Design a protein around this ligand. Structure first.
Ligand code: HTF
Length: 171
């Protein structure tokens, strides 16, 4: 207790994110922070706009293969807002039925697979890349202001994931 205990939590995480030594452990930590609360399932999305290759996206998740196949098979990346920087009008996204009011075949399938609500972030960097994270939760309960201690920590997790993973990946 010294008016700075939240700064010290940030300092502790900054040290841990540097000690990862890999992009894999950087993202794995932020997803383990969801699993530690027994939420449901976790997800990362990453994109490398390389000039030497055709442009590509990578993504990681503990989701059921029936959702992961169905999402890929119909190419739900075309209709999902969690990868579209224009929807992040204050740098952040929240799941309500209103947000999914066009993405109804995303929400109905996600609801069935156990992704009963979720939480989402984005960042932009002058060094390049782009990246996103989202936690799902089996608690079908409302998103208000998310919860202040989660809403700030989410902006921290997206910053440090994008920062640590960018400085490891360079693309
Ligand atoms: C192939 C899976 C990619 C993982 C990245 C998240 C994609 C996803 O499942 N999004 C849905 C899940 C329910 O709400 C959404 O916006």
């Amino acid at each position: 207790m010294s008016d700075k205990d939240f700064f010290s939590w940030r300092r502790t995480m900054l040290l841990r994110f540097q000690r990862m030594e890999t992009a894999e452990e950087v993202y794995h930590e932020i997803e383990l922070q969801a699993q530690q609360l027994e939420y449901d399932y976790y997800s990362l999305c990453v994109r490398h706009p390389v000039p030497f290759t055709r442009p590509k996206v990578a993504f990681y998740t503990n989701y059921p293969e029936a959702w992961v196949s169905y999402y890929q098979a119909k190419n739900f990346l075309a209709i999902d807002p969690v990868l579209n920087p224009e929807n992040f009008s204050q740098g952040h996204l929240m799941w309500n039925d209103d947000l999914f009011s066009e993405a109804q075949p995303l929400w109905e399938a996600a609801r069935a697979h156990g992704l009963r609500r979720g939480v989402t972030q984005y960042l932009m960097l002058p060094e390049r890349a782009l990246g996103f994270l989202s936690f799902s939760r089996c608690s079908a309960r409302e998103i208000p202001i998310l919860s202040d201690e989660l809403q700030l920590k989410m902006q921290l997790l997206v910053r440090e994931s994008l920062m640590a993973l960018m400085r490891l990946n360079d693309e």
